[model samples]
Target chain A: SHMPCPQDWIWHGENCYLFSSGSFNWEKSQEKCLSLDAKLLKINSTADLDFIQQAISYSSFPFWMGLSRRNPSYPWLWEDGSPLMPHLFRVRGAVSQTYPSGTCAYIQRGAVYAENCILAAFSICQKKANLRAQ
Target chain B: SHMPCPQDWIWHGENCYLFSSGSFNWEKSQEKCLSLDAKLLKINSTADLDFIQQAISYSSFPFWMGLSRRNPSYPWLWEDGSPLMPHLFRVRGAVSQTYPSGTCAYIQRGAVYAENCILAAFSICQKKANLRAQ
Candidate 1:
């Protein structure tokens, strides 16, 4: 059985993105994405972040990505711990006033930041589609 | 006539807090707070942040504070241009993976970060409550 991307997912480059229609906590969001064989979105560059943001323009709340940490003292890492890191971000961490302390990060509008992992919000899942082999 | 805070609010130190009964966009939240002669919560330290978080623990969603900016390039500021800055926060701005965006910040389980000003969420209003002179 051939599965050419799931319903409501848009194809962009080598990945298929599903801007979630529902919201959940970080744990449940990852679980739902994994159930579909897709991991939470791990942005690789500005293009990836911008594409996801544009794809989910109608949403009123933030969308969760796979970027997070166990605590404020721990390092932020992806669920899979892949090496590549996205460069485009929107935070004022230098001044120390806007520094974050949550165990998870979510993408809102277009910028990503750490936030309360337990807060219910939308998730973006990314995975390679079983496209036709020409 | 001596004003003793207001209905449904509690005195905490030199200020009074109303864990808002409803949710709104950051703009509307600010307006609503101003209407009540208060401003959206401006946390000055971990104690203030923790107190409000504890007071609003019943809320199922994040609460908007007065911390925000207009764009990614702009600096985050309070509605009032006062000087004292809060020390406790919850963003992974150091690693670059969890940087923030948008123009507003909200409190959830004792963390703060920039988020979409248009997204409707609860607000935390803080103002000085005039008590009877001793």
Candidate 2:
């Protein structure tokens, strides 16, 4: 029999996702997803991103994601403290301009942007749906 | 010689993408893109979505895209007022729970989720690079 996911969660492939409507700063959003035993949504591929895009079209609001910039830094970093590579970016080469300092990233509709950290917004959380039992 | 695109835009595969970090509601986002002779990111394919994901990992803020729900109704619609198909959604079908009413969707990091409409976040706009000059 297939094991079911917990409350307030939806199963998609091997993982589960939570689109929390509560407003919170970037840091707070991370902690909340952590409390759910999950991490902020860290999209790994096109399918993952598309899955998310499809789910969020219902309403229009900003939601926190797992990726962020390193403290007072240049290259953006993932929640796991890994550097975000340029190849993954959709913009063309020799691209200039980035989010100003003191700003954080979030998603509204299906696009991402950098905005003030103090501004609170909803969030998206995700984690593995199952771990093999011993 | 290749014609240069307008300011605050990036060229990608015969299209020009503007990841405008400005805040706006879904409708406003659409308007802004239109003013720039563009539209909110519609995401026609996985590659297109991937392109947007790559550019957005830089910041942690929300931005309006080219999608939203019809006036007080089900089945989200694209920027052009077209119906959003279930196959495009990444979430598992028959999945329960979604963004509540009085909210809008946005992309944070690479994931999508819903949030408030009154609460403003950043925005992204896109347009075709070449419409074929007369």
Candidate 3:
């Protein structure tokens, strides 16, 4: 009896979204996402990023996505990389043209920017599909 | 670095949710969820079910939450339950006082009901928080 994904939320290409009005630390937000058995947003393409950013614009707040790197062996994998897709993110490192420290991603209402994982900003996520973990 | 969770979305006792009006099936829908890095509805408590129900009434579409059970040891766990929670759902399989097969869950506008995972329904998912893998 595999649990099914919830509804109404748009499913573009191969992604589902969680449009949010609240905010939290990157770590905390990840915990919340796993609570439902999913990762945060795992960006795959520019188009996917665009759709999400646009959605966030409706709320005018910064939203987090599936973009963190707490592991090394699998660090290169997106949130859902059983088979792995082509990487759409930049290289990991210190110092950014923007900022550093917490290595997560957030789309601030039509704006893609660097943010503090624990800053408590608003969020809109893209949940991956296919697997039945619930 | 393990990917942290998205921000703003609510996290109650280990589950996160995606609010929306678009929907899909048990399979194609699952693919969509996996695309982002998450799974579907997995009901744990009456409170969790309630918060989600309220959120759905706002959008007015039948939003899906992480409640599928495609597995059986790990199956009982809430999406994040590396340790698992006390069982809250009834039994598995067959007949419906409600419905059958698709073996998944969906809350219908302040109401929880049995649904076909492939119905192309609306959804609101709860992603488990904290485990960065993106």
Off by over 4 Å in 2: A85-102, A131-134, B1-134
How does model 1 score on DockQ?
Answer: 0.01
lDDT of 2 by residue, A16-114 (tens): 677664678888888898987889987777677676766565446777777675344455567888755544434221224343434566766677766
Model 3, B30-121: lDDT tens per residue? 56666667666666566765656544432334555555544332253334443224454344332143224344555554555445555666
* Residue B86 shift from truth in candidate 2, angstroms: 32
For model 3, the superposed segments whose C-alpha errors exceed 4 Å read: A1-4, A69-101, A130-134, B1-134
**What is candidate 2's lDDT per residue for B1-134, written digit by digit as tens?**
13334422455665766655456666666677788878877777777777777656545777666666523446666768776555554522122334343445677777776555555767777777653431
Over all chains combined, what TM-score does candidate 1 have? 0.44
Q: What is the lDDT of residue A133 in candidate 3?
A: 44
Q: Score the docking of each candidate (DockQ).
A: 0.01, 0.02, 0.02
Residues A24-121, candidate 3, lDDT per residue (tens digit)?
77777777777756667766667765656544432445566656543333343445653224444444332143234455556553544544455665
Question: Model 3: which docking level applies?
Answer: incorrect
Model 1, A64-113: lDDT tens digits are 88877655455567888763363566432222222234567787656666
